[PDB]
């Protein structure tokens, strides 16, 4: 029995960044070289660990976050970043130890005349703590008078949509992201290599 990395990477639908998906990998064996040497990836930066020494290591739990963002937005999926995605949608801790893997998904995630399925939070009142997840669809109150579910002046629906058409730019097309975090606790470690 080995880890369901197929269930995450080769899944048909990917979550919206604002509602990122988290899969818990536990009690299994992994081959992180069949990932590193797939040469099908746009971005593969690791942090506080090295990708080729990854199959020699054990962890107590491995976390696989996944979502979709714009290309110019893959830069903010990194420790110490700011911008709408890293501030309001997905933050990584300054002490991050793990890997951030993206690829271009224009093929499946951009639809002719717009893919209005993939969202992001555009309005928030404070920055996210690392690995926070805000799914609130409340009307954003930008003024001093409440909004009471009515969109209007000072009252913005807080989630916008990416256009996502196959005739978009390059760092403006849909990329799928997968963030592999590696945690080690004082508990039996059950995600090792061969």
């Amino acid at each position, epitope marked *: 029995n080995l880890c369901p990395f197929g269930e995450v990477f080769n899944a048909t639908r990917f979550a919206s960044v604002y509602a990122w998906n988290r899969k818990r990998i536990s009690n299994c064996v992994a081959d992180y070289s069949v990932l590193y040497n797939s040469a099908s990836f746009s971005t593969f930066k690791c942090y506080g660990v090295s990708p080729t020494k990854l199959n020699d290591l054990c962890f107590t739990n491995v976390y696989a976050d996944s979502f979709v963002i714009r290309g110019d937005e893959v830069r903010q999926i990194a420790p110490g970043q700011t911008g709408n995605i890293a*501030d309001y949608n997905y933050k990584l801790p300054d002490d991050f130890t793990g890997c951030v893997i993206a690829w271009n998904s224009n093929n499946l995630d951009s639809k002719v005349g717009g893919n209005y399925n993939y969202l992001y939070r*555009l309005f928030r009142k404070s*920055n996210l703590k690392p690995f926070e997840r805000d799914i609130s669809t409340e009307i954003y109150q*930008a003024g001093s008078t409440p909004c009471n579910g009515v969109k209007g002046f000072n009252c913005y629906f807080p989630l916008q949509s990416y256009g996502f058409q196959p005739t978009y730019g390059v760092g*403006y097309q849909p990329y799928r992201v997968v963030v592999l975090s590696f945690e080690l606790l004082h508990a039996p470690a059950t995600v090792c290599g061969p």
Partner: antibody
Amino acid sequence: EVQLVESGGGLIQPGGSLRLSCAASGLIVSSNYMSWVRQAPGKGLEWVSVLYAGGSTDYAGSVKGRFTISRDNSKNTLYLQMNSLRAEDTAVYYCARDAAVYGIDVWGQGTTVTVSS
Amino acid sequence: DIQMTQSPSSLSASVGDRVTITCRASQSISSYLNWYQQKPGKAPKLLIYAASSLQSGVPSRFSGSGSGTDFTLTISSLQPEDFATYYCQQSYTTPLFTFGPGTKVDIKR
């Protein structure tokens, strides 16, 4: 009463400093994308710097490291500190509320900033 | 970086005419595109948001159209206080917007 009230332009020698001010009514700066945009004599609108609701900051290539945009929730006021001013920074400085997809709907009156030796 | 270009740097029109400004983006920005009016010495004034939505308190003769690389501000019946300069602005890269160069409409003679 939605109003943005700029203050603090004037003349300045190159290398000097000015503090621009933008006092607000009818919106909370703390809760908004607040930008400074400038318009040079005869030219158009160039975006300068922005203050995300969460406190992040971004700046134009040209002013990065010379301007710092801040705020005081207490006085509900946007600020732009302009240091090491050059001649090209001569323009009019609008503060404005970026409501993103719904437009830049609220603008200040402007304040003129002239850098010359 | 998206660059916005506006076609007639200056065009002439008489009161009651049907005036058409255009804007063009260097990439497709879908419908993230706003129109502004500026009169000499005053601040910009938002006209259309989201390519086609009329802003509050702006006369119904103003209308927006377009989705992608090309857009159009239309004044249905040009009125005397409408002699101005009209700018387009993309909201695709919020909050780092970039503007158009402007179109100026002056009085035909």
